[PDB]
Amino acid sequence: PHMQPFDSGHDDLVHDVVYDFYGRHVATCSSDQHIKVFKLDKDTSNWELSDSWRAHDSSIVAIDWASPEYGRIIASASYDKTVKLWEEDPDQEECSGRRWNKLCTLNDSKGSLYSVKFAPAHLGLKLACLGNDGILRLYDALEPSDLRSWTLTSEMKVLSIPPANHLQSDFCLSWCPSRFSPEKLAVSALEQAIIYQRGKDGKLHVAAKLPGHKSLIRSISWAPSIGRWYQLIATGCKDGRIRIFKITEKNLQVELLSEHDDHNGEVWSVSWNLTGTILSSAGDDGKVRLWKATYSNEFKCMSVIT
Amino acid sequence: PHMQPFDSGHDDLVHDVVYDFYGRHVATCSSDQHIKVFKLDKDTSNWELSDSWRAHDSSIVAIDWASPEYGRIIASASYDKTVKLWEEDPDQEECSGRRWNKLCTLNDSKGSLYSVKFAPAHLGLKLACLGNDGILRLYDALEPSDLRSWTLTSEMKVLSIPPANHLQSDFCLSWCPSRFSPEKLAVSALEQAIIYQRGKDGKLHVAAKLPGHKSLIRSISWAPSIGRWYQLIATGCKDGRIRIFKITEKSNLQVELLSEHDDHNGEVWSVSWNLTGTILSSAGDDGKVRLWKATYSNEFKCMSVIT
């Protein structure tokens, strides 16, 4: 059952679409340097533009919503080397172009930015970003009252020497959602994919790598480990394979659970369920595949949308 | 050189246009619930839109700028029973619709609002408003640092009762600009026009009335009394007459009527003063603007008619 598609309202290509916490809102960002937010009308089950606005001087590539317990906040990353934060002002008409106020700007990056992800709420307003400079940066809104008070918490050189050629480069972030697991996050930078963990010293250290990728990692996402003791992160590589890694900490162990080339071409998007019960993958073949785990913990394709 | 008209950019009728302190900026408010601010480009002596934005849920009728010594602040009154204050954020692109941030909202009024006027700077950020509820209200930004800290300073029942069919009502405000004169302001409410003065008890009391109006007072403004000791306030009535009252305080107030002029033959909608209170303007149905200067005898004479 397909539903009535709709126009985003963007002129240039759209890079990311993201859901709010409740799944009733979506934020869109494209190259036309705009961020659009759609609302899912209760009555007429249709998606309808809540507000659109110009937000960056260059192409906006990444986007993300903060936990509802900190307000209505969106974050954006652009090729203009910045990350901007916005907060919805309910006292403005929708579509007015002025429904979301910039709360701040992060200019520390000296290279374009490809990704930005808020951290799990149980760690406060925190976030990460990664760009050409090959330097992952974490920021913290130390005082949850001042949603402008964004301090820089950490800086790590993912690539020792960022190659810097033919912008044939890719980077991705994904925090470990787990509430009852030590703070950590995954990062992909080209062929490599590495995991960081908070130490007793309050600093990030590299705790492992997800080996096997023979090309560019287009996407990666940590799955919600509700119920499980272990962690699972999936990656969609350019070599045309979905990979699912089981990470156990007894400090971290790394198993490869599955590999799937069903896409025959690059896997662009890899996404998870809210319960981490279903995993999605999309690619060149112009198809989306949904995967469930077997009783043996292998992964099986439960359906193919096209 | 180049005094050509220009479009405001409003869809519905425009109610008020106001100049900033320096005369280089203008704020416009219309029924389309927008407030536009124009800039007078130094180089090309043209007026060009600085920023426009939706500010009220209903028709915006009045507007006004605060003294430059408190920042870039505008105040607006609407039929939506509110008065909003805005402060310009120089760190925003012009025309972005995001150049003026709401600093506060005053909801105390239970009837639509027709007028709002900032008080003379020598009294702090203070302001007044009047609406259907027939209750004039003064607000004070007690701490000039917190341009959100707007407290309510006073409430006075102008029209004993606020009756109204809401089909023929008008209200106007105008503070006495004078720096070396006791705080006071004029208020028009329909046929009546009354003056309030601050007492020793820090409360407003009615110190006089400007008698003679035989219809609705569309406009009134106190003139800058630079050089003079007496005060002069003019009113443009619907009965088609401009009136200029000389008010002297010998503190109790005297009231003389200096001039009456029907040259307009129809209602006088706008009555305005000079920065020195040297020239008085009037506009009306006849589609003409008249400028008036005072004679040596203190009568007023029409020194020109624009059409």
UniProtKB/Swiss-Prot annotation, chain A:
It is a peripheral membrane protein. One of its GO terms (molecular function) is structural constituent of nuclear pore. Component of the nuclear pore complex (NPC). NPC constitutes the exclusive means of nucleocytoplasmic transport. NPCs allow the passive diffusion of ions and small molecules and the active, nuclear transport receptor-mediated bidirectional transport of macromolecules such as proteins, RNAs, ribonucleoparticles (RNPs), and ribosomal subunits across the nuclear envelope. Due to its 8-fold rotational symmetry, all subunits are present with 8 copies or multiples thereof. Belongs to the WD repeat SEC13 family. The gene is SEH1. Present with 952 molecules/cell in log phase SD medium. Pfam families: WD40 (PF00400). One of its GO terms (cellular component) is nuclear pore. This is Nucleoporin SEH1.
